[PDB]
């Protein structure tokens, strides 16, 4: 082995990625295809994948490990990182003749300058002597919203969050969430944490996080049933007003071909001068990261 041969400049065919408009923080698939019409493939030989990852614009590669397979037999491996995508080859890519093949992953886009100056707004990706642009345009809340995303660094885990009374406003009740988690998932506890920001501004986490929330709240009830995925907030009338809560989770993830994580949640408030919600759904739902890589040689 010895080395690794940087095989880009000379072995990447085409790259390519859809949608090439995206919106800030949004989703976008990239392809990169190869043969050895320029040079035979050998054990060692890598091939990159780069993109901006600080000034203006921030693409942010999904966490993905996709093995390249000829005939049942792993003859390479496709590397996805925040930073970089990777594609190595090991030695049984040596038996191969006529390679060809290709690594589809989805990225994230961000702009970080939100700005709309046409030229800080695109994003280059390249790979060898091939490159493709990404246009990432730059980015009042009601009183509860549901939802979630999923780290660009951690693919394991799907983040949700239940911002409740964002607008900071007097209640005339005691604020009531019921949160459901759906199959697919399992509910991480320690991974909760509770930001609060208003008269009472305070953040709580750790495994301390439930309990520290209760006693500097008291009333305040987060029922957790762990094997139920189920979590159940009351909130007291007299430190729900003038005061936003921001409950974080993480999931780990238990079926891994599953396509979308839904988590709903029910919510009972009344905004003093508005009308009562009773029951009313928040609902979200996450999409999964897609990854795939193919690869095709004869064995002569």
Request: glycine share 8%; charged share 20%; no cysteine.
């Amino acid at each position: 082995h010895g080395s690794a041969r940087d095989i880009s400049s000379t072995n990447v065919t085409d790259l390519t990625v859809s949608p090439s408009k995206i919106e800030d923080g949004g989703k976008t698939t990239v392809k990169m295809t190869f043969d050895d019409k320029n040079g035979k493939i050998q054990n060692g030989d890598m091939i990159k994948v780069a993109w901006p990852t600080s000034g203006t614009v921030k693409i942010e590669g999904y966490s993905k490990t996709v093995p390249l397979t000829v005939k049942g037999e792993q003859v390479g491996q496709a590397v996805i990182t925040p930073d970089g995508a990777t594609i190595t080859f090991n030695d049984k890519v040596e038996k191969l003749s006529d390679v060809s093949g290709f690594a589809e992953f989805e990225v994230q886009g961000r702009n970080l300058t939100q700005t709309n100056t046409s030229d800080d707004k695109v994003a280059t990706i390249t790979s060898g002597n091939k490159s493709t642009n990404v246009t990432v345009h730059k980015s009042s809340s009601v009183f509860y919203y549901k939802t979630g995303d999923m780290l660009p660094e951690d693919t394991t885990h799907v983040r949700w969050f239940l911002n409740i009374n964002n607008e900071k406003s007097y209640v005339s009740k005691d604020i009531t969430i019921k949160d459901q988690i759906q199959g697919g998932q399992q509910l991480d506890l320690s991974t909760l944490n509770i930001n609060v920001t208003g008269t009472h501004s305070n953040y709580y986490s750790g495994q301390s996080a439930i309990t520290d929330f209760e006693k500097a709240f008291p009333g305040s009830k987060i029922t957790v049933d762990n094997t139920k995925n189920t979590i159940d907030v009351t909130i007291p009338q007299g430190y729900g007003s003038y005061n936003s809560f921001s409950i974080n989770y993480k999931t780990k993830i238990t079926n891994e071909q599953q396509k979308e994580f839904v988590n709903n949640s029910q919510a009972w408030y009344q905004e003093h001068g508005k009308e009562e919600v009773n029951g009313k759904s928040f609902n979200h739902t996450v999409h999964n990261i897609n990854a795939n890589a193919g690869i095709e040689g004869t064995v002569k």
